[PDB]
PDB file of C-alpha atoms in Angstrom:
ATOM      1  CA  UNK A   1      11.591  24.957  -6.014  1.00 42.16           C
ATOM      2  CA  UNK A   2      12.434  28.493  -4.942  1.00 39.85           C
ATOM      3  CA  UNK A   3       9.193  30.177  -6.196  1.00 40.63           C
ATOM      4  CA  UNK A   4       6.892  31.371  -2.515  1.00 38.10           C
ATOM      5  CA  UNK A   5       6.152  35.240  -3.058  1.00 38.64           C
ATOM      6  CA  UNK A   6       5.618  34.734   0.278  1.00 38.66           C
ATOM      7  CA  UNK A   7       3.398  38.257   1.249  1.00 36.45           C
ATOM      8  CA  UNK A   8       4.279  39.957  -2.206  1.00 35.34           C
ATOM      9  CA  UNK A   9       1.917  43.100  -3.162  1.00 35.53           C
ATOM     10  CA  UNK A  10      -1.038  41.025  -2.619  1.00 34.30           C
ATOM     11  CA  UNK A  11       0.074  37.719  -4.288  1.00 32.43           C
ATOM     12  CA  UNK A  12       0.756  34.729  -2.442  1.00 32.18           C
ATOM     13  CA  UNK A  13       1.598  30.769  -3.781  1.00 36.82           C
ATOM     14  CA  UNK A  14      -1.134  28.509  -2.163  1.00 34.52           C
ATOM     15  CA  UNK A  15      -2.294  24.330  -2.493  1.00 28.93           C
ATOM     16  CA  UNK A  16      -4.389  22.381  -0.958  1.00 27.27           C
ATOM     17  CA  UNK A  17      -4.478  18.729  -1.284  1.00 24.77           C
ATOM     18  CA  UNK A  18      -7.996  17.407  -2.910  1.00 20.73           C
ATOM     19  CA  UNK A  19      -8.819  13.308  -3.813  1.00 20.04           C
ATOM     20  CA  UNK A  20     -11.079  12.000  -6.471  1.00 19.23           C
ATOM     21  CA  UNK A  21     -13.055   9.167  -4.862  1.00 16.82           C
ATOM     22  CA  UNK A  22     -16.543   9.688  -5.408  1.00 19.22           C
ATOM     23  CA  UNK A  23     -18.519   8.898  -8.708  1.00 18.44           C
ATOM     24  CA  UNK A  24     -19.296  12.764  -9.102  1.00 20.17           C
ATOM     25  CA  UNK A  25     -17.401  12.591 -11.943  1.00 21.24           C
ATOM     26  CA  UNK A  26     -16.361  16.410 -10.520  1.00 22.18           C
ATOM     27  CA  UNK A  27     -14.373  18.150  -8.092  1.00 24.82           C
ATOM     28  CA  UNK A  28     -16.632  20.814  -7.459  1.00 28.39           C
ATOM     29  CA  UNK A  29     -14.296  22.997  -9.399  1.00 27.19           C
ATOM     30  CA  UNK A  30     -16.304  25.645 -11.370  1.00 25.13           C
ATOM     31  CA  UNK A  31     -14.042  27.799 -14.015  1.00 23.36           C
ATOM     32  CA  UNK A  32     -14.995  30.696 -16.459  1.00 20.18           C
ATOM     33  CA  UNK A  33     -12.715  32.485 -19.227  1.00 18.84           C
ATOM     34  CA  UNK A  34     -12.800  36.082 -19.263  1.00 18.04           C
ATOM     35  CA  UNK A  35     -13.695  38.249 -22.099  1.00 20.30           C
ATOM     36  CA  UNK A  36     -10.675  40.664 -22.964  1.00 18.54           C
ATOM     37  CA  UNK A  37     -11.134  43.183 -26.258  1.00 20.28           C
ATOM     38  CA  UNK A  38      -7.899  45.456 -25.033  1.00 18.76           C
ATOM     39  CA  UNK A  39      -4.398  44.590 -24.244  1.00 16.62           C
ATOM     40  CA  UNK A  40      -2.669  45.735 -20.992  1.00 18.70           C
ATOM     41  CA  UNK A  41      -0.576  42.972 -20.235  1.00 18.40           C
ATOM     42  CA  UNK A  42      -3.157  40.414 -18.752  1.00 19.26           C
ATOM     43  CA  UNK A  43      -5.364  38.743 -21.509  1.00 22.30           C
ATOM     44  CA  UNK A  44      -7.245  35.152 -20.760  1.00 22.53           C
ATOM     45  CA  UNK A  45      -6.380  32.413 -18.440  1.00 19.95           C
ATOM     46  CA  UNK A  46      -7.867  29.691 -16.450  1.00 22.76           C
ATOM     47  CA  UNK A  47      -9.693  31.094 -12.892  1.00 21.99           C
ATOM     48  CA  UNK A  48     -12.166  29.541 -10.165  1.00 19.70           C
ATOM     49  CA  UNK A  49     -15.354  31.832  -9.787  1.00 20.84           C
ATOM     50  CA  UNK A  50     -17.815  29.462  -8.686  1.00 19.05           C
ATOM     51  CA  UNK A  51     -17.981  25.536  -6.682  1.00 18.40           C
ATOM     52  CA  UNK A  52     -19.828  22.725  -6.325  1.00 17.72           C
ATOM     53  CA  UNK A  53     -21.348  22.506  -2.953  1.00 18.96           C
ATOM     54  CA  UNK A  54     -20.759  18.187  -1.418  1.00 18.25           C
ATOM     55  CA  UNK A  55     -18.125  18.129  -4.136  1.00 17.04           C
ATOM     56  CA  UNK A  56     -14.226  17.558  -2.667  1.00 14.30           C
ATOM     57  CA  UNK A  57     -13.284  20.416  -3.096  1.00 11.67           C
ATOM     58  CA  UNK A  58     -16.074  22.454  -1.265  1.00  9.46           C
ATOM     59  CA  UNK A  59     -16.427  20.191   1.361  1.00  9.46           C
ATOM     60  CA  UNK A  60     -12.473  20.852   1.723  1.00  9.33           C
ATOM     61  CA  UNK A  61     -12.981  24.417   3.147  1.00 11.29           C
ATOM     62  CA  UNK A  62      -9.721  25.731   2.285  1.00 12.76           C
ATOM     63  CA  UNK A  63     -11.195  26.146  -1.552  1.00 12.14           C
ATOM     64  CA  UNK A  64     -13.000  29.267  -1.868  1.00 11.40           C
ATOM     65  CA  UNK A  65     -14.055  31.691  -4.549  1.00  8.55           C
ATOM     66  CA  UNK A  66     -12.241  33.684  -6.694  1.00  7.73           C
ATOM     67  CA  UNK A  67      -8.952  32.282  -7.490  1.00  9.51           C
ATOM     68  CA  UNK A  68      -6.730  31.548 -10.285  1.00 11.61           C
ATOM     69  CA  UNK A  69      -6.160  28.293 -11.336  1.00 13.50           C
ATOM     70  CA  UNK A  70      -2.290  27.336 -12.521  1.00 12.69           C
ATOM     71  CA  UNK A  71      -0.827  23.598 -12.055  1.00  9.95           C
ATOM     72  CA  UNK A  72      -2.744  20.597 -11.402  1.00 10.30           C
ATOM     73  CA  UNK A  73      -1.526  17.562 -10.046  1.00  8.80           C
ATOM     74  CA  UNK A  74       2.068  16.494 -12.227  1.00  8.27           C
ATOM     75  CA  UNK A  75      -0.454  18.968 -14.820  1.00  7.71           C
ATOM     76  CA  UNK A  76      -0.476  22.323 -15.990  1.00  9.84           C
ATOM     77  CA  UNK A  77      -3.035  24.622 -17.016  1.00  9.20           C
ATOM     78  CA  UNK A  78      -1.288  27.624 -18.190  1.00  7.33           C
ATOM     79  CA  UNK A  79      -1.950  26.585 -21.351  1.00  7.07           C
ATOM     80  CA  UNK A  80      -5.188  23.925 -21.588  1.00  8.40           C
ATOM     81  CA  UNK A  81      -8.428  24.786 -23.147  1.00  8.67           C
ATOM     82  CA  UNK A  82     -10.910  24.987 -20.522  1.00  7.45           C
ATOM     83  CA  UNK A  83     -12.945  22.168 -21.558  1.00  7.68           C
ATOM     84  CA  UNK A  84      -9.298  19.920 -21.701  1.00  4.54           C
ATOM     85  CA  UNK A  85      -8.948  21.163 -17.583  1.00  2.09           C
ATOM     86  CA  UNK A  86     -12.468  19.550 -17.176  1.00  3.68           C
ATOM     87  CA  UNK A  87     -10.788  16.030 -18.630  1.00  4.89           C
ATOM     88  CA  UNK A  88      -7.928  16.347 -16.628  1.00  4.02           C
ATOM     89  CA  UNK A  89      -9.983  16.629 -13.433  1.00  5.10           C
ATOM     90  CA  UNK A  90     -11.760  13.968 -14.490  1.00  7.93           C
ATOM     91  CA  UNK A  91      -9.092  11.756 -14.981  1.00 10.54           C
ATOM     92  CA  UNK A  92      -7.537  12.051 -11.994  1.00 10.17           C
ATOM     93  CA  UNK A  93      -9.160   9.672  -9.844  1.00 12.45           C
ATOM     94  CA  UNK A  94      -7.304   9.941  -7.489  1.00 11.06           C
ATOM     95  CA  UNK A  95      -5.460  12.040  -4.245  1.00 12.78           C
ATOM     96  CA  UNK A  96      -4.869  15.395  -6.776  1.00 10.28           C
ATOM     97  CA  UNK A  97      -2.622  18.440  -5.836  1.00  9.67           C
ATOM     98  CA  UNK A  98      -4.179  21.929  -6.338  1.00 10.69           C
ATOM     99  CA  UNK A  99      -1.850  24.747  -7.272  1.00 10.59           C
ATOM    100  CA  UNK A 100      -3.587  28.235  -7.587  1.00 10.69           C
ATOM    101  CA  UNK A 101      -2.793  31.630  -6.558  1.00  9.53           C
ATOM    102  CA  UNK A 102      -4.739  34.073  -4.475  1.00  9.12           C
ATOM    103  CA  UNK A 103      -4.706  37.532  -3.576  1.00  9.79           C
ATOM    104  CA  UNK A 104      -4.360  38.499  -0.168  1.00  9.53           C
ATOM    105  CA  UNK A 105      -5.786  42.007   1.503  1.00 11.24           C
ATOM    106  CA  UNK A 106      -3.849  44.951   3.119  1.00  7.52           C
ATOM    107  CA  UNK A 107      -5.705  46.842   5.482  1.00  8.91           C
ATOM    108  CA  UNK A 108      -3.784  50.081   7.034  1.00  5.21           C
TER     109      UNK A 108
END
């Protein structure tokens, strides 16, 4: 893999490593699709706005708000109805890999 955008106009690769071992049946992983009506290159897609508080993936720290969601563990979700990401999640089970992107700050 050769994809980092390591520091790139605000846009930066980052995972953390979550596990599904409680009978929450949840990650704490709270998504929302976004309502589009005009095209300007962006349209839809699969992003974090809210969490489940004594879920994994609160509890984890590194997961906070506003973030957009792209592989899962050995899964994608560039591509997955958002109620199909829920199953996924779901079925995991087990140790999962996050992959989402955030957008970092640049002040002065």
């Amino acid at each position: 893999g050769s994809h980092g955008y390591s520091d790139a106009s605000g846009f930066s690769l980052y995972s953390v490593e979550l596990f599904r071992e409680k009978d929450t049946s949840s990650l704490g992983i709270s998504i929302s699709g976004m309502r589009d009506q005009s095209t300007t290159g962006e349209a839809t897609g699969i992003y974090v706005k809210s969490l489940i508080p004594g879920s994994a993936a609160a509890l984890d720290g590194r997961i906070e708000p506003n973030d957009k969601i792209l592989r899962v563990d050995d899964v994608n979700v560039q591509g997955m109805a958002q109620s199909d990401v829920v199953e996924v999640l779901r079925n995991a089970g087990n140790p999962v890999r996050l992959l989402l992107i955030r957008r970092l700050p640049l002040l002065e």
